[PDB]
Structure 1
Amino acid sequence: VLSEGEWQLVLHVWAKVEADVAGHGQDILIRLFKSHPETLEKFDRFKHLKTEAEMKASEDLKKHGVTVLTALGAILKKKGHHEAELKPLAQSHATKHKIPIKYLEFISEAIIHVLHSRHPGDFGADAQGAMNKALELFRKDIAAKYKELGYQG
C-alpha cells in the first residue's frame, strides 16, 4: 500500500510525462527491446526491427508506446484502486499476448530509467522509490490475475 505522500511523488513525475507521452513511449520500448531482446520477439508487429535507428523511425512503435503509457497513466491515477483497469490488461497479456510477469518487471525497469533521464529534478531517490513501489503494486496485482487464470508459472 503506497502512502499518499508516495502517490504524490509518482503522480508529480507522471504529469511531466504527459507533456510528451509519445517520446517517452519510444524511449521506454526501445530500452526494453535493447535490454531484453526476448521481449521484442513477443511483438509480431515489431520483430522486423533489427537496429535502434529502425526502432526510432517506426511510427507504429511510437503509436504503441502511447497506447502503453496511456493505459499505465490511467492505472497510476487510480492510486491503487485500479481493479477495473487491470482486469482487462491482465487478461489480454496472460492469455492472448503471452507476456510473462518477468517481462513486466523488465518494462518497469525501463520506465524508471527513462523517467530518471528525462526528469531528474522530479525523480530523485524518494520519487524513484515511490515509482518502484507503484510499479511493484501493478505487477503484484497483475500476477494475482495471472495466477487465477493459470499463468503465473
Structure 2
Amino acid sequence: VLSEGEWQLVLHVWAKVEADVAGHGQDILIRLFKSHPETLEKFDRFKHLKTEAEMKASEDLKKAGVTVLTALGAILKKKGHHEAELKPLAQSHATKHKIPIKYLEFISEAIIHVLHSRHPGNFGADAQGAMNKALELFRKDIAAKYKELGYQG
C-alpha cells in the first residue's frame, strides 16, 4: 500500500510525461524492444521492426505508446483503486495477447529507465522508489487477476 506522499511523487513525474506522452512512449517502447527483443515477438503489427530508426519512424508504434501510457496513467491516477481499469487489461493481456508477468516487469524497467533519464528533476531516489512501488502494485494486482482468469503469467 502506497502512502499519499508516495503517490504524489508518482503523479508529479507523470505530470512531466504528460507534456509529451507520444515522445515518452517512443523512448519507453524502444528501450523495451532493445533491452528485451523477445518482447517484440508478441506484436503482430511490430515484430518486423528491425532497428531503433524503424521504431522511431513508426506512426503505429507512436500511437501504441500513447495508448499504453495513457492507460497506465489512468491506473496511476486511481492511486491503487484501479480494480475497474485492471479488469479489461488483465483479460486482454492474459487471453488474447499472452503477456507474461516477466514482460510486465520488463516494461516497468523501461519506464523507470526513461524517467530516470529524462526527469532527474522529478525522479530522484525517493520518487523512483515510489514509482517502483506503484508499478509493483500494478503487477501484483494484474498477476492476481491473471490467476482468476486462468493464466499462470
TM interval, short-chain normalised? over 0.9
2-structure distance, mates of 1:38, 1:146: 21
Cα displacement (A) at 1:48? 1.1
SS of the residue corresponding to residue 121 of structure 1 reads coil
SS of the residue corresponding to residue 2 of structure 1 reads coil
5 Å-filtered alignment, 1:29-44, equals: 29-44=29-44
Q: Runs (4+) of structure 1 moved beyond 2 Å?
A: none
Cα displacement (A) at 1:150? 1.8
Cα displacement (A) at 1:151? 1.1
Q: How many aligned residue pairs are there?
A: 153
Matched, 1:24 2:35: no
Identity of aligned residues (%): 99
What does the per-residue CA deviation read over 1:73-131, in whole Å, with 9 as the maximum and x for residues that have no partner? Answer: 00000000000000000000000000001100000000000011111010000000000
2-structure distance, mates of 1:76, 1:2: 11
SS of the residue corresponding to residue 146 of structure 1 reads helix
2-structure distance, mates of 1:52, 1:20: 19
1-structure distance, mates of 2:59, 2:117: 22
1-structure distance, mates of 2:152, 2:20: 34
SS of the residue corresponding to residue 120 of structure 1 reads coil
Under a length normalisation based on structure 1, what TM-score does the superposition of the two structures give? 0.99
1:15 maps to 15
1:133 maps to 133
- How large is the RMSD of aligned CA atoms in angstroms? 0.6
2-structure distance, mates of 1:8, 1:125: 14
| Gap regions ≥5 residues in structure 2 | none
SS of the residue corresponding to residue 42 of structure 2 reads coil
1-structure distance, mates of 2:29, 2:67: 11
2-structure distance, mates of 1:149, 1:89: 12
Under a length normalisation based on structure 2, what TM-score does the superposition of the two structures give? 0.99
